[PDB]
Symmetry: C6
Subunit: 63 residues, 6 copies
């Protein structure tokens, strides 16, 4: 319901994000793609982030 | 008996009560509940951030709702 | 099986509890109500605690 | 092959073997297993506390069972 | 698919292992038995380790 | 739309790209992806270790794949 539109906006507008993980680690980058289980976050490389380990997805600026 | 989550969150959303959301890592988020579904809560501060419910430990109202 | 009777006793007898979360945070208060997914714990306000984030529910004194 | 959890916990319960339960936050609980079901273990020390299995990492007997 | 053969080898060859838990605790011992949900790890006693709390199972030496 | 995990991990495995796997406890593992299924990844360094996906937060390639 809410997840896809929220991520799709950030993706299509190529907005930089902060992804806070359940281990307290903050990841930064661009949302490259996503599905039901993972987000591909691009910085220097494309890394695969499991949604089950994500606490919050924060836009760097109002979207 | 069933079912407490939606009425609780809807009340906070409709009355615009500021909340603290404690995450499973111990990080505290603050803001107002903009919207929510079965999996996520949209929490508004300066930006609207998407919080996964699986990562939430407790939702604490800053003051009584209703 | 065990969960509802255990919580219902603490609720109906209005016994103060300590709820330890998976993040190590200890919450204190009265069990106001509960369902399959959440417990409402009352102190100054009613806060909603997700069971998935609860490690243990400890009565403050023998029940 | 299936299924180890119930016989393990029942043995500790019936022989009244003191256990240490390590939680996913690293907190160690100690006591005797009073009862359990599919979701929780009731652990008795001075009080009976309800421990969620989803929050348990390991159950360590203080001494050999049987 | 991969889990059972991997653990069964360590068990049948009685290879000592390190089991890292999601709480950062490292457990050491021999794999005594296992099923879909738990591993019994033997050191001084047999302890029951929930798979849901395991991050990695590391053989102490090449297997 | 569906489905990203297998092609991502298979690419790293086939090109033998060294990866860093960050676990939910914040521990970083390093090695090459030897194999994987729906539940685990076999990560090779000096030894082959079995990593549970439920305990993984992010898989970070050490360099671009393809």
């Amino acid at each position: 319901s809410l997840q896809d539109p929220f991520l799709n906006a950030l993706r299509r507008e190529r907005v930089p994000v902060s992804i806070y993980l359940v281990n307290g680690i903050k990841l930064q980058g661009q949302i490259e793609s996503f599905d039901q289980w993972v987000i591909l976050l691009k910085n220097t490389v494309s890394q695969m982030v499991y949604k089950h380990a994500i606490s919050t997805v924060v836009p760097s600026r109002p979207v």
